[PDB]
Symmetry: D2
Subunit: 370 residues, 4 copies
Amino acid sequence: KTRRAEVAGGGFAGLTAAIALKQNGWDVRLHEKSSELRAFGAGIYLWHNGLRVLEGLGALDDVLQGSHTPPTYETWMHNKSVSKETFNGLPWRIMTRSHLHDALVNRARALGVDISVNSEAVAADPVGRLTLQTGEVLEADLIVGADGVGSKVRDSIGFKQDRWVSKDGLIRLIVPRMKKELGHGEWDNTIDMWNFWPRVQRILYSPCNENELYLGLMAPAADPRGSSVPIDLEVWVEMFPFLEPCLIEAAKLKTARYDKYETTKLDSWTRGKVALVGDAAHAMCPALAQGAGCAMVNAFSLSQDLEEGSSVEDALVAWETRIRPITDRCQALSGDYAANRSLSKGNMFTPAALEAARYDPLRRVYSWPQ
Amino acid sequence: KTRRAEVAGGGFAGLTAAIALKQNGWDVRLHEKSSELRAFGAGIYLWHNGLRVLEGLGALDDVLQGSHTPPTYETWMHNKSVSKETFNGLPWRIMTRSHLHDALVNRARALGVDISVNSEAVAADPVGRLTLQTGEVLEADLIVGADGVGSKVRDSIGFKQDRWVSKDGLIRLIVPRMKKELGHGEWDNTIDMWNFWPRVQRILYSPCNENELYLGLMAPAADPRGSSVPIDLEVWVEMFPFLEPCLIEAAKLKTARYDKYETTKLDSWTRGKVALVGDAAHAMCPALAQGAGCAMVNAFSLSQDLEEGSSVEDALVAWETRIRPITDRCQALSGDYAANRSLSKGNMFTPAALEAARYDPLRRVYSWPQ
Amino acid sequence: KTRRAEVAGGGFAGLTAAIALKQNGWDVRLHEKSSELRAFGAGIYLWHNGLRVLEGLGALDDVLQGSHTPPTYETWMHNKSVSKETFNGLPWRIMTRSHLHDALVNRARALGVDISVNSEAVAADPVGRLTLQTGEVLEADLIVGADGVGSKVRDSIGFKQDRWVSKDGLIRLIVPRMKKELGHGEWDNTIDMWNFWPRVQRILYSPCNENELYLGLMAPAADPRGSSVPIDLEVWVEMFPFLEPCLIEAAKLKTARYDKYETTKLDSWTRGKVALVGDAAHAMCPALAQGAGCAMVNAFSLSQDLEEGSSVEDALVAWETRIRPITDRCQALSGDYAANRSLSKGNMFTPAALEAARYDPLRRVYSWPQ
Amino acid sequence: KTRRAEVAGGGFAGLTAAIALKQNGWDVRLHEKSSELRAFGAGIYLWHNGLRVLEGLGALDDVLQGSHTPPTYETWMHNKSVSKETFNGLPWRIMTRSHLHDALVNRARALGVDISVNSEAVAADPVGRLTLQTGEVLEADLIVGADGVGSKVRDSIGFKQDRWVSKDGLIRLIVPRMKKELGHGEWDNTIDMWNFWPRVQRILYSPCNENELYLGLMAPAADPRGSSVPIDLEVWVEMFPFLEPCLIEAAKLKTARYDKYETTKLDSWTRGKVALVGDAAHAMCPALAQGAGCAMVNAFSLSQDLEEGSSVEDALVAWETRIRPITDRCQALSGDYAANRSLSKGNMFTPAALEAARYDPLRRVYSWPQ
Ligand SMILES: Cc1cc2nc3c(=O)[nH]c(=O)nc-3n(C[C@H](O)[C@H](O)[C@H](O)COP(=O)(O)OP(=O)(O)OC[C@H]3O[C@@H](n4cnc5c(N)ncnc54)[C@H](O)[C@@H]3O)c2cc1C
Ligand SMILES: Cc1cc2nc3c(=O)[nH]c(=O)nc-3n(C[C@H](O)[C@H](O)[C@H](O)COP(=O)(O)OP(=O)(O)OC[C@H]3O[C@@H](n4cnc5c(N)ncnc54)[C@H](O)[C@@H]3O)c2cc1C
Ligand SMILES: Cc1cc2nc3c(=O)[nH]c(=O)nc-3n(C[C@H](O)[C@H](O)[C@H](O)COP(=O)(O)OP(=O)(O)OC[C@H]3O[C@@H](n4cnc5c(N)ncnc54)[C@H](O)[C@@H]3O)c2cc1C
Ligand SMILES: Cc1cc2nc3c(=O)[nH]c(=O)nc-3n(C[C@H](O)[C@H](O)[C@H](O)COP(=O)(O)OP(=O)(O)OC[C@H]3O[C@@H](n4cnc5c(N)ncnc54)[C@H](O)[C@@H]3O)c2cc1C
């Protein structure tokens, strides 16, 4: 009859998969383990590739309204501007995580995607059986493992993998823009503010709209003050005095967390009727701001390959073969950028760095040449 | 049988119409009066609306490759920077006219649009008859008058109209970028360089790619030196000394022309099976850089309305009703900006000014909110 | 016995003469027509030449304390910075008129210069007789006519002369610095802010110290709004919006005057025992800011020539021959700068323009080479 | 009869002493150990205090002609401008060492100071006997020990002292300005270019005139590349790429030396008829650029105290009591600035830092208030 998909995970990968499948006439249920649908991480960047996914999902309008494209992506080293990049017109956007989340959830609900909260996938069978923590066993023609770095859809089946959790991380927050209080400057810009002296402290400054500012405060875990939550106001104001008004607001946040970086890589993304998408398959370093971009492109591309009249099993194999190398290359380059601190030099959004961003999943070609 | 369209005019409107119709399965012939297909005017700006038309035409890739999006659209008054605008991420692009022309011609030929040069439409009959200067009479289900401000498709039928040719104009040229020679600055920007003192002289500085620069040199016709062709090098270097390397190259051009501004407005754009598109119907002041944008949106939109299963006559009426107000408003605002010299103030690409640019003809909604 | 000098006028020329003579052992009385000692004109610039006079007068310490040397002398045309000049280290200073006045008066009193207020010289006899408006006739070995452009010491004797009072002028005021309120900029600079468009309005911005700002607001007399006192706040804020906080304070001043420019030139500066100094002899255009500088150098130089053991009559002739050409050249060049609006171009403090400033009256050589 | 002075040392202290004494009618001979009169160290800064000494010596004109006052004293940290200081008009000047040397030598010769080269003082007797390495014993009313950090006039007598030679130092050179090749910037400025990351390397950039640039390249002795002579071009270009044209010229200099810092401090500067001046008495860290300034003020002040009608012995005691505290304070503060790297912060030419510079030795008061 009507093809049935069960999607595990209510993040950006899972919502993208669910919407894309529902648009193509699948009956879709999405399962979120948490008690409510929420997106963590404060803010997020999307690029052309991700914006094209949103267009394909019919969720672009709600995203662009109330989000921001900075006039330029600027990099500082020790308070000296070292580069300003605009990517030869390649579209990009900054927004709060909740803003993107809301657009996707609203679109899924409008389409009639069934959503279950407090519903955790704990086992998946490649023949198309999904077991929830409740003991309910669902039969489906497709099972999507969009359940994050700790994917149980993945681990119940067994996928050869390398995972890494870093010792280091960052504190991500949303604070008021305080634009007037920042005084003279280019405060609508993205500004990646690097320092190695007198200490290793960095802030990625990311306006989301006229009201909200996304800050990432990065210091090594071995730095007891820089890695402290709620933030140690003094050590941040000392090295970023021009952001004092915003940092004062940041210091009020008792919910602040020092989140560590984490990566996953698998030899394969499929097993029978099961496809792994997003961080379940390819969590990467955030240097190129493509973790969700690739997750969304991959989820959308999955729906495309399922429209070819092949068996689900064959479509899934074809899907990975077609789409995975863009992600493998992006993940590898992101990890290398992170390790070499490449972004600190500025002008590092090269044609190769922008490969993932340049991909248009709708037409399946690369656009916005560099 | 197969629906037949005859298109008069090989400009951007005519090529857009021809491609769009051919993609929808029309048999299409395009007639260009001139001995060869060529686009005059040196350079051109397109925005989101026009870029979306190109996407819809399958001609976007060839356009983006080898064209330019400046990091910002900057305005100067008396050499003082008064604004820098990036339109909240709204896509835009600068290119040579030949670059856009070539992309459209190549796409039309790839699709099998028949093209006749030295073929001038001199009379059109609303019942679907087109007479060429050769005396050949063609029967068609649709006749597109894309034959410019002096449209004979229009005037052979008789459309109530207001036309205006200004006394004033400008000299448009392509010269080498000479980027190194320009020294320190932001020479990838669009820079609209206004002056009223010591004389009324203005240059719109518009990089097209890494090799080619589009310059518009604007001075009143009453100024014998500023309006002179080939350019009077001294009076331009005097007020724009920072562009001397480029102006020296400009002064070599014996083909330079002082072209006067011209507008057309009609009470109606249709008569039976005849539709008027582009400058034939709505030539406007270039302040908002939307003359071709609107022409292309209108031509593309025409093809859309012809896919509704209506008679051609009814589709044409529906087309104008649907699409004309965007153009009427843009034309009116452009004319008002020109007359009031509004752009000289900077920060004048307001939400209202950007209305046409914001329109997405593919989805028929407004995007890129301001 | 002790040589007796009577000095007419309590301006900078008269006070300089009185101090310089008293230091050399003259008995000196100074006569000021006005009811009190006061200096009008809001603020004033001095340069190396004038500062050296102050040193020679023992009045330099009180002047430098509480006055200002800007980091640079900056010129704007239509809000674009066209030059920044620092004169190769040549000393200069800005102060309120009252500040300079007070230093000179205090020094004169410390030395025992007799000062009479409400004492107007109405006739001077070259044999050494001075008649006051009171009818008192004083005998002296030297009479100094330091009584301004309308000198009665001069006109009672009869000196061939050319005088000119311009139709145009300016409004000079002292207002609070409002430095914080001016926001980002270089607000300790001298900034000469020229415009010809949209109207002829100019402000010379001249900080005097951390508290007081000297403004000169210049517009043609034919401009009813720009030349209005108290100032027409709107027309000044319109063209100088960045000075709004200071202009708001300026608009409160009910004492503001539109003062017209005035020049004097004489074929000779001496007659018997009478010497004319300052505006009585050589009032000039203020372009080079040397009116008082030359007056002070000339007054000081007069005292020098009187130490040569010559008759007073011979010393006076020698004095004019020695010192007058520096003033003649400065006056001529200042007038030419004013008429040609030369300062509007920036970088016009050339070696020739700075000749007067470069003169050291103490050592009688030119210093601070350019 | 005529008072006789013998001066040991042909540096700035010795020449200043010799000129000042000769002007007051002393018979003066100066003894320089080296085979010729020469000044080492590439370039030098003087301030108001030193410029006033030059005025008092009649050597100011030859110094100002062909030397430079930068528009501002600028400080960079990691290529970010952190301060621009102009010292509220306090006069200052940069020149090559040879330029200052030549002015002083020419003045000494014009006055008839006797100069002996290859003449080394090896012993001084407080009763007024000077023994040269030749075995010649000279009798004098005054012996000036201006013979540098290794003063034998000092050490032959025995003065309790603390001396320190640092392990660290710098490479001082004169190179062509290469102003055009430096491109856009403020290349007439003094720019103190600090870095601690990626390595400790600093350049003090000091224009001397339109032709000559004084560079100080500072790196720790423990850095084998940064401290290398002739300069290791690559490691300097890497951290100061904007100076590449000048550094290329610097790398040609086979005479370049890595000179270590050195200080001296004594409990007393006098013994009978012997006075110690300059580095013989008070060599200091160069942070405040006052080593020669203080030497010159002290030498000039010595001549002043010898005009009081006291015995030479009493005049010398009075001299030290009067003048030494300015030097003690300057030396102490300079050393503290050096150790704390205070100048790296910018805005450190405070009123206290500028105390020595503010002293006017001619009038014996402090001028140019801050
Ligand atoms: C610091 C940082 C900055 C980043 N910045 C960007 C950026 O700017 N742009 C960008 O594109 N990407 C960015 N990323 C990466 C991006 O956050 C992720 O790649 C993306 O959120 C992955 O989404 P997902 O849906 O695969 O997984 P997740 O977001 O982890 O979502 C899975 C959802 O899984 C639910 N769940 C888990 N287990 C189960 C289960 N067993 N059953 C049912 N539900 C389950 C999880 O609770 C959750 O609701 C960044 C990442 C980090 C760490
Ligand atoms: C100075 C200036 C700057 C501009 N800048 C921009 C800009 O930046 N961006 C933008 O979008 N627009 C811009 N425009 C407007 C843009 O140039 C026009 O709106 C656009 O080129 C109109 O195209 P069209 O096809 O309608 O007409 P045309 O370009 O005039 O083309 C019609 C073609 O008609 C052929 N022809 C004429 N008569 C016949 C006939 N009887 N039979 C067959 N063929 C015929 C003409 O020869 C020609 O080949 C600008 C205009 C001006 C004047
Ligand atoms: C707009 C403007 C800006 C200027 N800016 C500068 C500047 O920046 N730097 C600079 O150096 N110069 C400047 N000047 C010029 C400077 O103001 C004059 O040259 C200077 O004040 C002349 O001084 P004085 O003593 O000769 O005459 P005055 O200042 O006119 O003084 C004479 C004194 O004469 C008293 N008096 C008059 N008649 C008699 C009498 N019969 N008997 C007794 N007393 C009498 C007058 O009342 C008064 O008290 C400027 C001038 C103008 C107009
Ligand atoms: C890196 C550096 C930068 C500096 N920058 C500045 C600056 O910008 N401004 C400033 O004011 N100061 C500066 N100084 C300090 C300044 O260089 C010295 O304080 C000054 O040159 C000391 O001069 P002097 O005459 O006392 O001694 P010296 O310059 O050492 O001269 C004494 C002369 O002594 C001769 N001599 C030695 N022994 C005998 C003898 N026994 N008999 C006869 N002759 C003898 C020496 O050969 C020489 O000719 C700087 C110093 C250093 C190290």
